[PDB]
Design a binder for this molecule. Structure first.
Ligand SMILES: CC(=O)N[C@@H]1[C@@H](O)[C@H](O[C@@H]2O[C@H](CO[C@H]3O[C@H](CO)[C@@H](O)[C@H](O)[C@@H]3O[C@@H]3O[C@H](CO)[C@@H](O[C@@H]4O[C@H](CO)[C@H](O)[C@H](O)[C@H]4O)[C@H](O)[C@H]3NC(C)=O)[C@@H](O)[C@H](O[C@H]3O[C@H](CO)[C@@H](O)[C@H](O)[C@@H]3O[C@@H]3O[C@H](CO)[C@@H](O[C@@H]4O[C@H](CO)[C@H](O)[C@H](O)[C@H]4O)[C@H](O)[C@H]3NC(C)=O)[C@@H]2O)[C@@H](CO)O[C@H]1O
Length: 283
């Protein structure tokens, strides 16, 4: 019985399925697409358009969020890694501490959200040297996802500062999760440093079968030393074609022990698909 984490991309797709329509047996919802800078300054992106396409206005967004929380569903904000994380001015703030405070100020202080999930896969400087990727048998991936970036010290500082307000060691029960892949350059160093801070660690194993997820599990647990109970796999509902596999992964208990659960990308892309995955990981 794992967790069921639902991504709700706010780009207006499948509009009749409102954020508040997230069904029961869904533990958390991660607002996705919508950027934290829109939560920060609500006047820049008109409601009902772009990444606010899913809502009539910011008030509508705010109201639906509460609708989920009052039902006990945690609502997290997606935060994407960015090349500015590798600089001394992450997010254009003065330091990683400043960046961290800002995220805390916007996501928690202002929007009273339950935490954040880090989508780690964006471009930036590659590591140097680039290590030899272990390979498929060892990780479930063929090689590096060349479009990701190195977890340089500056990049690590950002996450470190964020762990002060989000995650297992932060106060006020705030979630800190990550959605990435063993193939992203920054993976290993992120886990060497913060695996224990993450409540859940999601692998974007879109389109995988149980065999491939197990391969990932072998590495995540054996080499990255991640507790099996934090591992969450990705159900690619957006694709609409891998449900049977997703359902199997959802029901599946890795050889290393009970996993954290499943995340669904995205629940609102195909509700029936998402419900099946939810049902599978829950029952
Ligand atoms: C966890 C995970 O799975 N990770 C990723 C997945 O995210 C990814 O799935 C796709 O995600 C896209 C969203 O990505 C953006 O948001 C996330 C979360 O914040 C970011 O991580 C990601 O990087 C994207 O954000 C980007 O941020 C950067 C900066 O932060 C922006 O760049 C800046 O831009 C400014 C300009 O202002 C300036 O130039 C700066 O210099 C520059 O840095 C960048 O703009 C921004 N990118 C975006 C997109 O905003 C989804 O969009 C994507 O969904 C589309 O594609 C999939 C294919 O996989 C389709 O299945 C799906 O149907 C969809 O198609 C689009 O659907 C929408 C839904 O409605 C349609 O919208 C309609 O559009 C109409 C006009 O065309 C009307 O407006 C209408 O009202 C509206 O509803 C749209 O028409 C469809 N068109 C497209 C694009 O096909 C998918 O979910 C996956 C797969 O790549 O990878 C995982 O690893």
């Amino acid at each position: 019985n794992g967790v069921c984490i639902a991504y709700y991309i706010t780009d207006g797709r499948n509009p009749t399925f409102k954020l508040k329509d997230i069904p029961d047996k869904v533990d958390m919802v991660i607002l996705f697409g919508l950027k934290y800078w829109s939560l920060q300054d609500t006047t820049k992106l008109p409601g009902g358009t772009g990444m606010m396409g899913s809502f009539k206005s910011y008030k509508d967004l705010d109201t639906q969020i509460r609708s989920l929380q009052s039902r006990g569903i945690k609502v997290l904000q997606n935060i994407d890694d960015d090349v500015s994380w590798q600089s001394s001015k992450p997010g254009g703030f003065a330091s990683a501490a400043a960046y961290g405070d800002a995220i805390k100020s916007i996501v928690i202080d202002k929007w009273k959200l339950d935490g954040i999930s880090l989508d780690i896969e964006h471009s930036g400087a590659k590591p140097n040297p680039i290590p030899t990727f272990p390979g498929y048998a060892a990780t479930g991936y063929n090689g590096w996802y060349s479009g990701s970036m190195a977890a340089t010290p500056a990049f690590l500082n950002v996450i470190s500062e964020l762990t002060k307000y989000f995650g297992t060691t932060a106060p006020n029960n705030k979630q800190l999760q990550i959605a990435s892949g063993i193939d992203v350059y920054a993976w290993n160093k992120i886990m060497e440093n913060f695996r224990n801070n993450f409540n859940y660690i999601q692998l974007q194993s879109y389109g995988a079968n149980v065999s491939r997820t197990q391969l990932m599990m072998n590495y995540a647990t054996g080499t990255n030393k991640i507790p099996a109970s934090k591992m969450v796999f990705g159900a690619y509902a957006e694709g609409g074609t891998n449900q049977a596999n997703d359902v199997e992964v959802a029901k599946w208990t890795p050889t290393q022990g009970a996993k954290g659960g499943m995340m669904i990308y995205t629940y609102n892309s195909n509700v029936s698909y998402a419900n099946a995955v939810r049902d599978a990981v829950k029952n």
